[PDB]
Enzyme design. Structure first.
Site, short mmCIF file in Angstrom:
data_model
loop_
_atom_site.label_atom_id
_atom_site.label_comp_id
_atom_site.label_asym_id
_atom_site.label_seq_id
_atom_site.Cartn_x
_atom_site.Cartn_y
_atom_site.Cartn_z
N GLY A 177 2.51 6.16 9.94
CA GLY A 177 3.89 5.97 9.56
C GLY A 177 4.38 4.87 9.99
O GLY A 177 5.46 4.60 9.85
N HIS A 199 0.70 -1.21 0.01
CA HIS A 199 -0.06 0.00 0.03
C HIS A 199 0.82 1.31 -0.17
O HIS A 199 0.24 2.29 -0.12
CB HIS A 199 -1.25 0.13 1.16
CG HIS A 199 -0.50 0.25 2.36
ND1 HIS A 199 -0.57 -0.73 3.38
CD2 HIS A 199 -0.15 1.38 3.01
CE1 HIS A 199 -0.02 -0.14 4.60
NE2 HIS A 199 0.27 1.19 4.30
N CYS A 219 3.21 1.73 9.54
CA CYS A 219 3.50 0.27 8.49
C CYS A 219 4.77 0.19 7.98
O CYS A 219 5.64 1.06 7.77
CB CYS A 219 2.20 0.81 7.34
SG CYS A 219 0.87 1.37 7.99
O1 LIG Z 1 -4.57 1.17 8.58
C1 LIG Z 1 -3.95 1.96 8.36
N1 LIG Z 1 -2.65 2.44 8.85
C2 LIG Z 1 -2.21 2.68 10.13
C3 LIG Z 1 -1.71 1.48 10.52
N2 LIG Z 1 -1.43 1.32 11.69
C4 LIG Z 1 -1.79 2.47 12.77
C5 LIG Z 1 -2.47 3.48 12.41
C6 LIG Z 1 -2.94 3.72 11.18
C7 LIG Z 1 -3.54 4.96 10.52
N3 LIG Z 1 -4.11 5.55 11.81
C8 LIG Z 1 -3.26 5.88 12.88
C9 LIG Z 1 -2.74 4.70 13.57
C10 LIG Z 1 -4.18 2.68 6.86
C11 LIG Z 1 -5.14 3.77 6.67
C12 LIG Z 1 -6.45 3.28 6.72
O2 LIG Z 1 -6.66 2.78 5.56
C13 LIG Z 1 -5.83 1.44 5.17
C14 LIG Z 1 -6.42 0.43 4.87
C15 LIG Z 1 -5.78 -0.75 4.50
C16 LIG Z 1 -4.21 -0.52 4.81
CL1 LIG Z 1 -3.39 -2.16 4.36
C17 LIG Z 1 -3.81 0.36 5.74
C18 LIG Z 1 -4.47 1.41 5.87
#
Ligand SMILES: O=C(Nc1cncc2c1CNCC2)[C@@H]1CCOc2ccc(Cl)cc21
Ligand SMILES: O=C(Nc1cncc2c1CNCC2)[C@@H]1CCOc2ccc(Cl)cc21
EC number: 3.4.19.12
Lengths: 304, 304
Positions: free
Chosen positions: A143, A41, A145
């Site tokens: 950030g 992603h 991920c």
């Molecule tokens: O979840 C996600 N990220 C993220 C990851 N870990 C902690 C946090 C966040 C975002 N908010 C703060 C805390 C992104 C954004 C939402 O839509 C998606 C959809 C699918 C996937 Cl694989 C990733 C995401």
């Protein structure tokens, strides 16, 4: 003595963290040998996350669109491929700090250490369990991920998790290092149900043995139970059913303490039915399920 | 989201761990620049620990009696000196992996990460607090002495603790990196009383703000209190008295959540008087005091 929620030393993994940018999206990557692994992603914008067609999105990207930075130096990307939900960026340079490593898919109930990273930089390390419903209860901000989970056996780092997503419930979901999600999750911004979570019974029992080893013995009782009677109670309290395989891995703890596994099951049964009565076990007022029997043996023996 | 007992990444400290042997005693040392720091009891046998005269014991030792091994290579000892309860072994080689570092003496209630080591090898990392009575509740087996506690601010490692001793109660005692014990402890095998321990009130309040940030809000009530009324309750429950200095450092958390510090004190007062009623806060059934207000700000903001 003393018993802590201990993480593996994170040094070998810190040396593998890089920052990966594609367009306006930046996340963490894992640099092992001449390959950088990151969540696929990274090629999406926020708008793309609603219903991404990753095959089509990646087709518009070339090697020069993936910016990979390790510390302060830039890595040259000479290849790119998608494997399930991860991108593999072939770089022209092998990471000189690549430790001995393996990619492993852990089972539900197994524990691992997470090195939380932002912009390719490590901020902290914590120990957690892969829940029976394939989610993890991490600590991840925007950030984070691409941050990875791992185990270490002397000099070998077995990478088992890469962070991808936070569910609307605040719990976390990710993949193994081949990009296969743990659980039913897909990398799309759509409300996704994580199943009913249960308590990891074998881990709680291991943690009760760790308490006995460190002196917390108040919960020991004059009773015993059978695997069948215990499982009737475990099912009532949303605990995972205990199998002979679980009893088998508790063997070293049963031997050290002289407390038979079914005797410890009887203590756990009483704790489930009556509660702690305002008491604590290893500094906790609840039944801890984030230590496997292997973790308890390792911590109590001193495996470095 | 999510809130974990997170340790600092341990890489910079792992590169400084060495094994120090003197006679039949082996423990961990810390190699920074051309100096190796370790507990001075490395020169004692078990029998010597009953009533050691360290000045006399060290006089019988020469540079060649201190064996220092880093990984697999031996370091040449060209000098030795005792500073309070630590030995400083001057080596002919500067540690090439010496990070930017400082020696700091932390205050009671402050938190730090411990890198537990055995035979100069790191086995695990955990986060803990220096108790108000200057003990730590670590996880240390035989051979763990010389393991260090630290904090990290971007690229600088502030070493604050070196492990020396386990009290008969199973709690731990050690020194700052100048060899001064935290607390009233002496490096002798004699039963030593650790004072009455108290709960670190400012840390509990910071952790309640971390719970509100992550969604656990059930404990919020329609009440408020004064610093005087709150301290009457804190004293009854063996909590540290809260000062305006503590209120001041909670300012960023009070600002983010919009919950005034005295309003959060009222929530804590009700939790102390009534208990949790079988509920949990951030996955804990008790009031956590091992996160400082700085730790909560750092974890909730993403400081790497
Ligand atoms: O979840 C996600 N990220 C993220 C990851 N870990 C902690 C946090 C966040 C975002 N908010 C703060 C805390 C992104 C954004 C939402 O839509 C998606 C959809 C699918 C996937 Cl694989 C990733 C995401
Ligand atoms: O406490 C000590 N070591 C130790 C340290 N941390 C954890 C454990 C141990 C030993 N048992 C297993 C757990 C030694 C031995 C006892 O007599 C003394 C007296 C003074 C000093 Cl500074 C050190 C020691």
């Amino acid at each position: 003595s003393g018993f802590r929620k201990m993480a593996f030393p994170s040094g070998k993994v810190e040396g593998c963290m890089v920052q990966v940018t594609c367009g306006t999206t930046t996340l963490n990557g894992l640099w092992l040998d001449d390959v950088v692994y990151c969540p696929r992603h990274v090629i999406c914008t926020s708008e793309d996350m609603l219903n991404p067609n990753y095959e089509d999105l990646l087709i518009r990207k070339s090697n020069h669109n993936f910016l990979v930075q390790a510390g302060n130096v830039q890595l040259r990307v000479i290849g790119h491929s998608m494997q399930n939900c991860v991108l593999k960026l072939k770089v022209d340079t092998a990471n000189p700090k690549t430790p001995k490593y393996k990619f492993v898919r852990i089972q539900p109930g197994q524990t691992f250490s997470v090195l939380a990273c932002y912009n390719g930089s490590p901020s902290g390390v914590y120990q957690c369990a892969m829940r029976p419903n394939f989610t993890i209860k991490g600590s991840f901000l925007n950030g984070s991920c691409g941050s990875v989970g791992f185990n270490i056996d002397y000099d070998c780092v077995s990478f088992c998790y890469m962070h991808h997503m936070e569910l609307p419930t605040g719990v976390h979901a990710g993949t193994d290092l081949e990009g296969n999600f743990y659980g039913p999750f897909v990398d799309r911004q759509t409300a996704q149900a994580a199943g009913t979570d249960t308590t990891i019974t074998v881990n709680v029992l291991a943690w009760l043995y760790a308490a006995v080893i460190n002196g917390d013995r108040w919960f020991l009782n004059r009773f015993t139970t059978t695997l069948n009677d215990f499982n009737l109670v475990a099912m009532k309290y949303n605990y995972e059913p205990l199998t002979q395989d679980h009893v088998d891995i508790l063997g070293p703890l049963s031997a050290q303490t002289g407390i038979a596994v079914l005797d410890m099951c009887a203590s756990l049964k009483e704790l489930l039915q009556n509660g702690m009565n305002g008491r604590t076990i290893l500094g906790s007022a609840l039944l801890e399920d984030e230590f496997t029997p292997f973790d308890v043996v390792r911590q109590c023996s001193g495996v470095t």
